[PDB]
Symmetry: D2
Subunit: 284 residues, 4 copies
């Protein structure tokens, strides 16, 4: 992918780049197309100095990527159901995740601007799931190619589960990426639960190795745009100040990979799952 129009400053070899010399407010078609190519190359891009970006322009920009979420309940900007308000007080959780993978159609990506927050504190990290897959040895890539996993959530107000390939192809690059994440993946469907725990434990740690991640410090006016299909992210929980972001969410992913090479694991009647590793029975 050719991207030569702007001044691009990559964060790490794995992913991330800050793009200078762009004004989002009245971006042209040609400049948008270039930002989209930079997103496909760098997975998350950062656009500094966009203070004052109008609501209408933010929505138009998001709609250049696809349909925008109009969340039923999460607060939105007055007059604009597509611009979601994220407040550290109103709702943090530092855990590696890919957004909404407990649903059959997770988002394609998001546009986030932190409009209020501390000068230091509250960094966001992203990880490169292409590299997480590619860094596995050949026998393990071949195994994962034929597996699926159940992703689920069960909290007050939301119960959802979905089955996805463990390895998905990015529809627009054709490259394969890992598609499990600590927050929302439950278990691999074709393994028993204990085998699944062991393999997922390894994959979660490996996939978020420092060599596969980047860490971004938010500044006034900074916009992050990321591809949810091939990344995880993590919100660092190291601040107590009020922190507010404006977020637009682009819907419409269908994670797709190889046909599974085995049936789901079927337990016998009465079989009990005894995890090999301790988790407490009571949270906080």
């Amino acid at each position: 992918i050719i991207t030569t129009a702007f001044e691009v400053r990559p964060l790490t070899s794995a992913l991330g780049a800050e793009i200078h010399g762009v004004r989002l407010e009245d971006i042209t078609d040609a400049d948008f197309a270039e930002l989209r190519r930079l997103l496909l190359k760098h997975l998350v891009i950062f656009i500094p100095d966009q203070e004052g970006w109008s609501a209408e322009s933010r929505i138009a920009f998001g709609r250049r990527f696809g349909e925008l979420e109009e969340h039923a309940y999460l607060p939105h900007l007055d007059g604009h159901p597509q611009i979601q308000i994220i407040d550290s007080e109103q709702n943090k959780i530092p855990i590696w995740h890919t957004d909404m993978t407990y649903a059959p159609n997770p988002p394609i990506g998001s546009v986030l601007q932190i409009v209020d927050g501390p000068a230091q504190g509250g960094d966001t990290m992203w990880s490169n799931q292409y590299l997480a897959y590619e860094g596995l040895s050949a026998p393990l890539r071949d195994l994962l190619d034929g597996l699926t996993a159940v992703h689920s959530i069960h909290i007050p107000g939301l119960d959802s589960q979905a089955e996805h390939p463990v390895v998905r192809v990015h529809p627009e690059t054709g490259r394969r990426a890992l598609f499990v994440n600590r927050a929302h993946t439950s278990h691999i469907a074709q393994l028993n639960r204990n085998e699944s725990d062991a393999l997922l434990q390894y994959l979660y740690r490996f996939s978020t190795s420092p060599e596969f991640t980047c860490r971004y410090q938010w500044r006034p006016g900074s916009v992050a745009i990321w591809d949810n299909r091939v990344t995880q992210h993590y919100a660092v929980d190291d601040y107590s100040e009020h922190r507010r972001g404006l977020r637009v969410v682009v819907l419409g992913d269908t994670p797709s990979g190889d046909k599974p090479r085995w049936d789901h694991y079927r337990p016998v009647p009465g079989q009990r799952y005894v995890p090999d590793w301790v988790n407490a029975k009571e949270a906080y």
Copy 2:
């Protein structure tokens, strides 16, 4: 403790002994007192060849130890609410546990006879919690002496939790024993959940080392009597035949140890527990 009356065949150095030359049916006071001393020395004792032991004698024997459970719902022998029927079909679960530690007053012990089952298969193992504590190095014994743990269960029909010392004294021997177990212990109260997971993971494995356990193969007419205050046990899940036992449960333990040396750990508002080790979100 002096025990010289019968022929005693210890199973292992850690615990367990088979007692020959005893007839439970009309046991004398003096012979019972000797069996009780052998229980305090060996933690679990096995009495072979007791086929035909009458219901009235089984209940009288149990009552020599204390008050007998008359479970509200678990099935009991016709005419005898104290003799519980345990059926592999009607209700197994192979997990190390101490009985009912999710309650404030777990049982003192049990008398179990397997009246129907396979010739091989379905062994029971017991562990010595005195040795599990004593085998910890001095800095760790000193730490555990001042901790407590929450034990809990949440299944259809039963929700219960209780806080117990991590190290308890046996009231009748004065010796200290570990009092956590994989099945029912949730978390150590004075640690955060992640620290608790790490320490409990170590203790669970260490406490069930082969050097601290014994394994008993059931035969027709065999009776096992064990002290629930200072043991764990584990039912091996390696058979498919029907397996039936008659069980009498002696109530009335209060696990007691040192006063805790620290307050309970208090999380901050909104704090989320993220286990360091994967467990699946969906059981079977």
Copy 3:
């Protein structure tokens, strides 16, 4: 005539009614059958078994080891003396898998020891393999592992299939063990650690093992090709065994489906889990 008493459904059986001293070819054929069925068998009441008969018995199975340095019975280089003092190690292992030709099996008799303490456990490696789900069995069928040992006076390593096919039964068995397996050759070391850690624990589940309490005159015979065993370290009394070791195994499995993992120059192995750098 033999009465067979299985210890567990997974493995192990005590065989009564046998006299090893002058066993006939036909009775030996039955013991052989029972060893292929039960993997380890225990023969009680053999006090006095002569040295010449013990050696002839082992030779029915194959060539006997004449260890250069282990003490042996005066006059009989094939009958090894195993003394808890002179030599224990409580660790799950399969014997000598760091060698290209491990033993087929062993015949052991604990002639001195405490009345309780010092049990030996065995595990069923057929069940350890069969209990894995289909995707994982498929993976392991195509893998090999390096087994090694590095102690004063012994350096050895060997590569073996992770899943071997027993030559007589045709049944597949796991062939890794905690004591001597180093790493799976086709994975990187960190992936290897994670998988082996799971397999070691799973393979010694109580549902796959048995535990034997030694009695005077009892002989244990086991197939080292499809078992692990573990010597429980819960005694301090003197414990002596007489052992004959049958050589000649060549673990055989599928051709690997992938090449060895090749690190890049200067690559460092950083284990994900801590081990101390200093032993005792």
Copy 4:
């Protein structure tokens, strides 16, 4: 005059408006204060810093290492040349803790390298200790640990408190690190493994670390007494740094509250977690 830009709330700050070449005693006092506050500081725009000034700067902190074998700048034995080719290792460590007197700290400038790739991370060992719950802090205060290294041309070990008191701030900091700590001396090895495994992961939580992208002319200065650091291994281009190392630390903590764990004769350490027996 200095503008301070913290990287994270845990640690790290970039200091603009500084000229190291002829820094005054009073301005140095301010840098020293900022190092005790931020643990690692980054000074951009120092291209051309003279060798004599670089050495004088390090000498303000203490005695400089003159390594016998590491290459150094022609004419200047104190200015070490660190080349990605000639010498990386991505592993969390505190420098030379296998020695009884580790460095107080270092001054590093990456003079050649890629525009992206090769970040360095640091962690705050004060926060790693303070984030433990009270029972565990109480335990660690009374423990010590053996740190060691065994490579061709270097064997060293040292015993240090698990929790050290920084000499200037009086604040307590964890003093174990994954690369060089072997085991806690007062526990058995298996207990030690379990606790160190927890501490290593906890101590390098994202909430306790920072990540720095090197730029031409940037100098990093850090306090090795209360940090770990990690060199990210995500590049293949040539990377050269100039480093001055300040010697003279003696980690100090509470007298241990227990004796060393003493194994019995013949006791074997069997780790609960697998590590391969062969590296690369």
